[PDB]
């Protein structure tokens, strides 16, 4: 029997615009965002802590409980202070 892993999308926003180069921590996994501002994680069932950090000093946190074969998109806005020139 194969336990189908959950798929978690995490989007980092700064009042609408995607944050480039933000680091998203979900469980033990780390992803540094591209132009999307979106990281996709494939995770085994369980409860996880999502944390989005960006070099400006802004952070967003959300705790998520994932079942078997769950698909969840998470959208976290870090405010206007997370918007940096170029």
Residues that bind other proteins (CB under 8 A): 1, 9, 11, 16-18, 34-38, 40, 46-47, 65, 69-73, 75
| Joined tokens for residue 82 | 């997370």
> Nearer Cβ to other proteins, position 42 or 57?
42
Residues 62 and 41 sit within 8 Å (Cβ to Cβ)? no
| Joined tokens for residue 41 | 């994680």
Nearest to 27 by CA among 72, 58, 66, 71: 66
> Nearer Cβ to other proteins, position 2 or 57?
2
**Minimum CB distance to other proteins, residue 33 (Å):** 10
């Amino acid at each position: 029997y194969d336990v189908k892993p959950a798929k978690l999308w995490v989007t980092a926003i700064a009042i609408g615009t995607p944050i480039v180069g933000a680091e998203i921590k979900v469980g033990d996994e780390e992803c540094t965002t591209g132009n999307n501002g979106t990281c996709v994680f494939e995770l085994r069932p369980g409860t996880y802590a999502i944390s989005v950090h960006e070099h400006g000093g802004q952070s967003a946190h959300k705790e998520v409980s994932l079942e078997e074969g769950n698909i969840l998109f998470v959208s976290l806005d870090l405010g206007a202070k997370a918007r940096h020139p170029s």
